[PDB]
Amino acid sequence: GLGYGSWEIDPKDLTFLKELGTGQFGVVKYGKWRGQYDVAIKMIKEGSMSEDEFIEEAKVMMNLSHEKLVQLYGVCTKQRPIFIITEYMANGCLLNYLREMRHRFQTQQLLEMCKDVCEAMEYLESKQFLHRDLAARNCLVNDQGVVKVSDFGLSRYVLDDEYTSSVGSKFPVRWSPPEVLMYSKFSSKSDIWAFGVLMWEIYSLGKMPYERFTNSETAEHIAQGLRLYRPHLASEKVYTIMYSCWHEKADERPTFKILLSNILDVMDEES
Template sequence: IFYLILLLEMCKDVSEGMSYLEDNQYIHRDLAARNCLVDSNGTIKVTDFGLSRYVLDDEYTSSVGSKFPVRWSPPEVLLYCKFSSKSDIWAFGVLMWEVYTLGRMPYDRWNNTEIVEKITAGHRLYRPQLANDKVYSIMNSCWHEVHSLY
């Protein structure tokens, strides 16, 4: 039971970091477990701001052909290159999935083209074994938050 509390605590730390970014009008655009570090107290810190953007209207459209993390991206990014705090929320749901699968690669059996096809058709990641229904409903709510944008 202790490790389940630890997994939830990790997700909470990331959500607080992402809330701080949104409050300060930044879109991370590359939120994933690989871009989080653990400090000496066991607190998770969001890092790697190479793709981050400061935005005034909570939206950033990247140029066609730009690289972005397909496995962590919502339909409006995959189809229209439109990023917002909502696309960071989607990525947070995928990060939660990574945490609760103990580091599995999202959509590990699909290539980028297949991922785009499946995500835009409505496919979502399955419930990890370690995630109870309540935790999985949080993940799912992250993946449904964005639809109003496209």
């Protein structure tokens, strides 16, 4: 209504129900919008985000719509902290989900998780939109076990420089290709590399990539042409797909469309 643009939600329409956790931007809550609709409410800690730049970009993010992307519903920005309102995902963060051994996942389930993410990424790629921090910790799981990609592009608005370059102590070194670590060259192909590492995370049931190495040691390892190796649960065909994401030459890495076709082929052959 009056006083709100299409990207703006009236915070008075929110009912807060439960705290979900605390991330780098602060607290996230579960609630309802207009008494009925489940939402996640991210309360952005003062000084953590380039808020004006994010708000302008939220207008673009609003129009990203794909079943395997966690939907942005709008922002509450008349205030502080500002809120980001998104789709609620009842089963939480993929990294934590993978690590719960009770699930006793079949490999077909793991491949489906990879396909969920690959469909989201193929969509983003078709819109020339980079994730820039793809990893299991940025995927969420709904009450039907569907995995969706979250926080696409959001790293661009982080003000804490520990996160923002390879010079930083919290940069995602373990999900970065050599050209990012060496030269800060981000591209579709750095998302492709990260996706291969995510596949590895899924098939490893949430192990940290390069688990015995520091970030520094990982960067060395990678730049010397060495790689993660095959998780026990990955068939040779699945390993070929994730490994293809790690070509030293970025242009020799597949597209998300090609990865999706490869994943579908393996599903058909392994079903």
